[PDB]
Amino acid sequence: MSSIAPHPVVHVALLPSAGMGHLTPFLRLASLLLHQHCHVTLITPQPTVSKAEEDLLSRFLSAFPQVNQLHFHLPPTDPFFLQFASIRSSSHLLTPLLSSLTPPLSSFIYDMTLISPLLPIAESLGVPHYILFTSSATMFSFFSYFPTLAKSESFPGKLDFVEIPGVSVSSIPRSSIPPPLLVPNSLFGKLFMEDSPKLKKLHGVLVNTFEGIEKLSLEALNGGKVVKGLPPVYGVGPFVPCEFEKVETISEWLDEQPSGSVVYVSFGSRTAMGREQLREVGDGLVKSGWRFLWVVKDKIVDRAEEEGLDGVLGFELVERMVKEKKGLVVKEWVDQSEILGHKAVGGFVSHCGWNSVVEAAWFGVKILGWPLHGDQKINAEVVAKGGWGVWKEGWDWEGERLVKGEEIGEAIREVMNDESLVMKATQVKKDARKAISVGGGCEVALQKLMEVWK
């Protein structure tokens, strides 16, 4: 009535660390913020470990030319862990690029693996600053609680159960603890010890989760039950898959299969089974009798792939799969969300990386959990507690045992024959939509955050 002005711009800077499991939720968060009319600066540590990260970033930036990319050129062990440490070690060199941002920065959201080097930088900027935690809220509870465990003089040798008050997995046995945390000199063990005590300095923690799958962990974190004085935890999931991620023979094959008849199999973007274990997967898929879409990795890093899929699988397995005409096997980057959203896919053999879990939740696809490393056993039990997936506790971390094709096929048939899992997965899918609708946890949290930043 008394002013005609360019309405103020909320400017968010984002900093993702290594791996598709970190880039993907940051770019989906970016898309959400852009839809709330934020200006977004994206800091891109270069070069990326994997080609998939490289190509996704390119597709994102061409989909959103309004995004301001800040190049973060890194100086020249698990290759993604090595990148985590390099980004961390070079982070103190981001201050001049963040200080010079225009329009004025409103908030700063950085990767949970970068807390210690970035915290003083964020405090220098004088804006609300946050981590985006890319794993489950239950895993975040474990992360927050870790200094309480590691203070013990019998850590890590004497620790049989981790029972965090009020969370979605009330008892985490030692066999589900991320294995590096039980080795007394690992990168993540040191990161946990240096970073978790500094959580209280953040303005908040964003998590790609929602009440439909982690109601208890969300309530425990925000009620002071996990660690007193933790910053507010915002359930801003489910992160809905976005158009820019798409890159047509797979979808054409899925178009030919009966509804719900295909078992999708993938163990993420950075994990490769051993050769013998990999071939047992194929044996189990054939033995299951179900149609399957099996995504194979022979190397951790896609750039390192060097053997043809026929040689990886071997003559005998290839021969059985081509003869029965029930499965499709690919050693390439697929559009996992396009696949999970296809009516033909009725189940998901997943390593239970958190992004894959929440995608399965979004599409209501029941899970056969096969956790392999890291946070995956905790995530598998978050799913199983909700009754929309199952996992076999005795299969153990990848490389500890050889899971045979007979028991893989039995587990696949068990999950695909279980209609109670579909019922619960469909209610999760219903709640996934509630979370992003007006009044849902994600809509409420984003409006809170936007109002603080304004």
Ligand SMILES: O=c1ccn([C@@H]2O[C@H](COP(=O)(O)OP(=O)(O)O)[C@@H](O)[C@H]2O)c(=O)[nH]1
């Ligand atoms: O061929 C592939 C493999 C993976 N993904 C996606 O890559 C991410 C994997 O992240 P997650 O946290 O599930 O596991 P991680 O890859 O970090 O082990 C998810 O968004 C999957 O949809 C994909 O689109 N195509």
Ligand SMILES: O=C(CCc1ccc(O)cc1)c1c(O)cc(O)cc1O
């Ligand atoms: O322990 C965690 C929890 C996430 C996490 C990793 C690093 C960090 O600095 C903070 C939180 C973990 C691993 O240990 C190993 C993994 O393959 C994945 C994974 O999710």
